[PDB]
Amino acid sequence: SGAIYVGNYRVVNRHLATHNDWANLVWEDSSRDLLVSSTTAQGCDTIARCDCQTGVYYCSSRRKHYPVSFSKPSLIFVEASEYYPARYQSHLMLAVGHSEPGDCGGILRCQHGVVGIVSTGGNGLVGFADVRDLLWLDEE
Numbered sequence: 001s002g003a004i005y006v007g008n009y010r011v012v013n014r015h016l017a018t019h020n021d022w023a024n025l026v027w028e029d030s031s032r033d034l035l036v037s038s039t040t041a042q043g044c045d046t047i048a049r050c051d052c053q054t055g056v057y058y059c060s061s062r063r064k065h066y067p068v069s070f071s072k073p074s075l076i077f078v079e080a081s082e083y084y085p086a087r088y089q090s091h092l093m094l095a096v097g098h099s100e101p102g103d104c105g106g107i108l109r110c111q112h113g114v115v116g117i118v119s120t121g122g123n124g125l126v127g128f129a130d131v132r133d134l135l136w137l138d139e140e
């Protein structure tokens with residue numbers, strides 16, 4: 001589990017969105033596994049605006065932050081899970097690292113701020129949903 005809290009937005013994995021998220025919806029994209037809901041309180045996370053390919057992610061199944069090298073956001077065939085069929089997930093970045101399904105929502109960050117959230121993994125890979133192109137997270 002886990003979210004990004006930027007301004008009056010909450011950024012979660014679409015597959016982990018709550019009823020309250022859906023009832024307060026700003027934007028959702030199944031192909032990206034992203035959903036954004038509105039919040040009453042202002043958040044403290046800042047979004048990175050950059051093409052960093054190194055950073056650090058949180059792994060809940062190890063209670064550890066790991067430094068990683070990751071690919072640029074791409075279209076990647078990801079295997080079926082209990083939440084999606086085997087499909088092309090867009091704006092996805094891959095790294096070598098430990099993940100389990102419940103690690104979804106852990107933050108990936110670089111020197112500039114938050115880069116994305118855990119979305120996929122297995123066999124010593126972890127996939128992150130990028131948010132650096134969502135410039136509207138920084139306004140209104």
Ligand SMILES: Cn1nc(C(=O)NCC(F)(F)c2ccccn2)c2ccccc21
Pocket residue numbers: 015033078079080081082083084085089099100101102103104118119120121122123126127
């Ligand atoms: C970090 N992590 N996430 C998953 C996972 O099932 N992801 C859920 C999901 F986003 F809906 C998904 C994404 C893409 C395709 C199908 N389902 C996983 C599985 C094994 C080991 C690590 C893992």
Ligand SMILES: [Zn+2]
Pocket residue numbers: 048049050051052110111112113
């Ligand atoms: Zn950066």
